[PDB]
Amino acid sequence: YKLICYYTSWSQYREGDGSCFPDAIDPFLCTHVIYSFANISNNEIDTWEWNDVTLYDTLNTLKNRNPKLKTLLSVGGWNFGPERFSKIASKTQSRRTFIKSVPPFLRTHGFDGLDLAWLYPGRRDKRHLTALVKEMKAEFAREAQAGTERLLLSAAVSAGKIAIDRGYDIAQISRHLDFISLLTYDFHGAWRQTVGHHSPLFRGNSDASSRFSNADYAVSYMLRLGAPANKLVMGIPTFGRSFTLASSKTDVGAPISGPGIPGRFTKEKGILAYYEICDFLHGATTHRFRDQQVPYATKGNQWVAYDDQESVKNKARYLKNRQLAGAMVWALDLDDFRGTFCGQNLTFPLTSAVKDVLARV
Numbered sequence: 001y002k003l004i005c006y007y008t009s010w011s012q013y014r015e016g017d018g019s020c021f022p023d024a025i026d027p028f029l030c031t032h033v034i035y036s037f038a039n040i041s042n043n044e045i046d047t048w049e050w051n052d053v054t055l056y057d058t059l060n061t062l063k064n065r066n067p068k069l070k071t072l073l074s075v076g077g078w079n080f081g082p083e084r085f086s087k088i089a090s091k092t093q094s095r096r097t098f099i100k101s102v103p104p105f106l107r108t109h110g111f112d113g114l115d116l117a118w119l120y121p122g123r124r125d126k127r128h129l130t131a132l133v134k135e136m137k138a139e140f141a142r143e144a145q146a147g148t149e150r151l152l153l154s155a156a157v158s159a160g161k162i163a164i165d166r167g168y169d170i171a172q173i174s175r176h177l178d179f180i181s182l183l184t185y186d187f188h189g190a191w192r193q194t195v196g197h198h199s200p201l202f203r204g205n206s207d208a209s210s211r212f213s214n215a216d217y218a219v220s221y222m223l224r225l226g227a228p229a230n231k232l233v234m235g236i237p238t239f240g241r242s243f244t245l246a247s248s249k250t251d252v253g254a255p256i257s258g259p260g261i262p263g264r265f266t267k268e269k270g271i272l273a274y275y276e277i278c279d280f281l282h283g284a285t286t287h288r289f290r291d292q293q294v295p296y297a298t299k300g301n302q303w304v305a306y307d308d309q310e311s312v313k314n315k316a317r318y319l320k321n322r323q324l325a326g327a328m329v330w331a332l333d334l335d336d337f338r339g340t341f342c343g344q345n346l347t348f349p350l351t352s353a354v355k356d357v358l359a360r361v
Ligand SMILES: *[C@@H]1O[C@H](CO)[C@@H](O[C@@H]2O[C@H](CO)[C@@H](O[C@H]3O[C@H](CO)[C@@H](O)[C@H](O)[C@@H]3O)[C@H](O)[C@H]2NC(C)=O)[C@H](O)[C@H]1NC(C)=O
Pocket: 039, 040, 041, 042, 047, 048, 049
């Protein structure tokens, strides 16, 4: 089993204990660590933060302690406009340029591969995403003739049916990618005025209306679409999604006024790190959807849908029974990396819970 963990660039700026550098990453925790978000500039891969070449270096020294570790650099991301990828992909001149620029960059900084995080290709992009992958992998084969090891190529793919039908030729791209991370955790959108969980494992009862918004469906769907099971990796989140209630209704379907208030460290409307959730639990009422097999909580007018040790071990067992390649954890820096926020004694409680199940057969 593979355990793919993303580390985010901007987490260094978090205040106090929230600050996180590659430094804190247990090198024996994951099989692949993905340094998150390289920019693309002048149609060539490039850094994003002023000190990336330093953190790049910091992350890859982890490999000196665990020579089995594999690292990748993700290009694209949530603050990299999708129209920008589009321009690059749909114009072969600029596409060959981006591709030719990649190997040297990775080799120079000690990475073992590239992760494409084109956040959502549209109807008019499908044919092009396929070319980018096909050609990018082709370039990777050639570059291995130099006697060095073949660089790995991966993609972070939407787990929403409409999104999947719209922009990906999964039968094609999966025959060329080394693995595919299914973004199975951003299901309840950014658009409802109703309370819901962003990562149910299963479908459930109250949900007679939005039927394919759970991990089980996404998986089954990728599978019948042509993706081999051993190239599929199911994303497990380490963050929670908050909501500010509009009535004293705490249960299923209650109305909301908007996203939840910002975490003291994470400073961002609608999102809380698991370590922020851990502090949030004291004084909160914890509930758990039996159907979807995921928990949520409430205090005053704050409703939080998150993942805990149990639900994460569950998603992990599922992944094993359907025989997937492994799990992906979004944000090593959103988990309790210091291990001094969540009561239990461990470092990275959530990610460790996944490793344990992956390792137990
Ligand atoms: C990611 O790459 C982006 C390039 O695709 C880049 O945005 C752009 O480049 C700079 C901003 O850094 C802006 O500025 C200009 O610099 C020249 C050099 O002196 C000036 O003579 C010109 O006035 C020019 O405008 C660009 O306007 C901007 N636009 C584009 C289309 O690239 C970002 O800087 C990169 N993002 C990060 C976070 O590093």
